[PDB]
Amino acid sequence: KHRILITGGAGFIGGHLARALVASGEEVTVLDDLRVPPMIPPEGTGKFLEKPVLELEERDLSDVRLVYHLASHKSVPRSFKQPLDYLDNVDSGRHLLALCTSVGVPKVVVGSTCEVYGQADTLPTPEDSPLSPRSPYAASKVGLEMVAGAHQRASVAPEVGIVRFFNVYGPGERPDALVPRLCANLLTRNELPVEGDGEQRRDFTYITDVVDKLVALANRPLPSVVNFGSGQSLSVNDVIRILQATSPAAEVARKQPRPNEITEFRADTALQTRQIGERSGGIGIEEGIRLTLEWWQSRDLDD
Numbered sequence: 001k002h003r004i005l006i007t008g009g010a011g012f013i014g015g016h017l018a019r020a021l022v023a024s025g026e027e028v029t030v031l032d033d034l035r036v037p038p039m040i041p042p043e044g045t046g047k048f049l050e051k052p053v054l055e056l057e058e059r060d061l062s063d064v065r066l067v068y069h070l071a072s073h074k075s076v077p078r079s080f081k082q083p084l085d086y087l088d089n090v091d092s093g094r095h096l097l098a099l100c101t102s103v104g105v106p107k108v109v110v111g112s113t114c115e116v117y118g119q120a121d122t123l124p125t126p127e128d129s130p131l132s133p134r135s136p137y138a139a140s141k142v143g144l145e146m147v148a149g150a151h152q153r154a155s156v157a158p159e160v161g162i163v164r165f166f167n168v169y170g171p172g173e174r175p176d177a178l179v180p181r182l183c184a185n186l187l188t189r190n191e192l193p194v195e196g197d198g199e200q201r202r203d204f205t206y207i208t209d210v211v212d213k214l215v216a217l218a219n220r221p222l223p224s225v226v227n228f229g230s231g232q233s234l235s236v237n238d239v240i241r242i243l244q245a246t247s248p249a250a251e252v253a254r255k256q257p258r259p260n261e262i263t264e265f266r267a268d269t270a271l272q273t274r275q276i277g278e279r280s281g282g283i284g285i286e287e288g289i290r291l292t293l294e295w296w297q298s299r300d301l302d303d
């Protein structure tokens with residue numbers, strides 16, 4: 001048992017993770033059914049299984065020591081329109097963890113999200129805070145966590161760790177998320193869309209930092225649940241500001257607010273710091289946005 005399998009491994013976090021592990025000398029399998037088109041063609045990320053997580057089989061796992069489960073439907077606003085489709089997130093986790101148990105896979109990292117906290121009543125938000133999902137997507141991640149929790153309580157393989165990602169951004173991320181949306185809109189429309197008043201706040205972490213942290217989990221005991229966030233929040237307006245510092249001509253296009261909007265996500269990082277320590281560096285928001293925008297600038301206008 002030596003291979004790493006990454007579900008969602010053609011997508012934004014999973015593709016970067018796959019590339020870093022292959023760059024490190026690891027034997028990597030990516031599993032991804034390409035149900036959303038990847039920004040970056042999958043080439044170079046290892047053996048590729050182009051199927052749903054639900055079609056994973058025993059033999060796909062037979063030499064696998066570690067799984068990163070990152071395959072998800074991940075859109076908060078769209079989950080209000082296709083709520084039943086989001087049940088696939090629960091089905092897939094139930095299937096994956098069942099198969100890992102029957103085969104004896106040693107470790108699984110399960111991707112979850114700060115959205116399971118809803119609007120938390122404790123800021124910064126610690127991992128023991130209760131669950132208050134405000135969308136069908138968030139509800140589906142709560143379901144996925146419940147499945148993983150049962151495996152955590154069971155005294156059988158895999159060791160299962162839940163990672164609650166806060167907002168991750170960077171090159172390669174599709175433009176339905178804030179930073180890339182703003183970039184893609186700034187470039188094709190000279191517009192910076194703001195949904196609602198823009199006072200709502202998110203905790204942003206740059207993709208390379210998140211990948212470094214995920215890799216640090218490959219060779220340490222997994223915490224049952226850990227926040228991956230920066231520990232600081234910024235308003236949508238703060239991000240807008242940073243971009244207009246770059247493009248003063250940009251027009252802010254007011255959009256309609258989201259339903260059940262969350263005013264602030266902010267990670268408590270004490271557990272993260274303890275389990276995986278912290279490195280000096282890390283990409284600040286100014287630089288991260290710039291690197292993201294530059295990446296978008298190297299994309300052909302049609303995009």
Ligand SMILES: NC(=O)c1ccc[n+]([C@@H]2O[C@H](COP(=O)([O-])OP(=O)(O)OC[C@H]3O[C@@H](n4cnc5c(N)ncnc54)[C@H](O)[C@@H]3O)[C@@H](O)[C@H]2O)c1
Nearest residue numbers: 008011012013033034035036052053071072111113165168
């Ligand atoms: N990006 C963030 O800002 C962020 C924040 C919090 C949580 N997360 C979580 O991180 C993970 C990865 O997010 P991302 O931004 O890379 O998304 P992504 O859309 O870029 O990648 C997910 C990949 O999974 C594939 N996929 C989805 N469902 C699948 C299924 N059941 N079977 C096979 N392939 C499937 C998609 O085709 C895609 O390439 C998800 O678990 C997501 O919920 C991401």
Ligand SMILES: CC(=O)N[C@H]1[C@@H](OP(=O)(O)OP(=O)(O)OC[C@H]2O[C@@H](n3ccc(=O)[nH]c3=O)[C@H](O)[C@@H]2O)O[C@H](CO)[C@@H](O)[C@@H]1O
Nearest residue numbers: 074076113114115166167176177178181193194195200258
């Ligand atoms: C698409 C995506 O990656 N979603 C992830 C993102 O959700 P989340 O919904 O926070 O991410 P978004 O980037 O979609 O939205 C962030 C904020 O910016 C606003 N907005 C967005 C786009 C825009 O062009 N203008 C604008 O003002 C939104 O209303 C929201 O208030 O982080 C979550 C953790 O918190 C994850 O669970 C989600 O999977």
